[PDB]
Amino acid sequence: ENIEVHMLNKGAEGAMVFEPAYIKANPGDTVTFIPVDKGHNVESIKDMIPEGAEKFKSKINENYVLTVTQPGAYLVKCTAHYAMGMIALIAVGDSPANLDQIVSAKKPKIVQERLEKVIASAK
């Protein structure tokens, strides 16, 4: 199945967001990132994707289709706006083994604040 995500300058949670920011999927699904506003892209964060998954980075303003294979949690960012909180959590399969690790990992405060909301207020 396919899940569409919009990359925006302003959305329900504030400035620079992915909508939705919480994506549930299964091995084999695709996630399509659509740059509704310009200046955005998607990139996997180091140490924040499952063991065995390949890292990825799309070009700015391009539509990007990510195929997810490995189960686990993935924290992705917009390269340009990571420090402004622009992230999404993907979640492949049930009880992703690396979720608690990603929540504990070092990252900007604003990012941590949004992650915590997406896990609570979206689960």
State the nearest-atom distance from the C-beta of 33 to Cu ion, in Å: 11
Peptide bond connecting 96 to the previous residue in cis, omega within 30 degrees of 0:
no
**Which tokens sit at 26?**
């299964």
- 40 near Cu ion (CB under 5 A): yes
Other C-beta atoms closer than 10 Å to the C-beta of 46 total: 9
Residue 40 counted as an annotated binding residue = yes
Say how far apart CA 75 and CA 70 lie, in whole Å: 13
Distances (CA, A) of 28 to 12, 69, 86, 94: 29, 6, 25, 14
Residue 78 counted as an annotated binding residue = yes
State the nearest-atom distance from the C-beta of 112 to Cu ion, in Å: 18
Residue nearest Cu ion, CB atom distance: 78
- 114 near Cu ion (CB under 5 A): no
State the nearest-atom distance from the C-beta of 15 to Cu ion, in Å: 10
Q: In this structure, what DSSP letter does residue 41 have? A: -
Nearer to Cu ion, 80 or 103 (CB): 80
Say how far apart CA 99 and CA 119 lie, in whole Å: 10
State the nearest-atom distance from the C-beta of 10 to Cu ion, in Å: 11
Instruction: Map the footprint of Cu ion across residues 66-105, applying CB under 5 A.
Output: 78, 80-81, 86
**Which tokens sit at 13?**
């949670």
Binding residues for Cu cation, as ranges, are 40, 78, 81, 86
- Using CB under 5 A as the criterion, which residues of the chain lie in contact with Cu ion when the complex forms? 40, 78, 80-81, 86
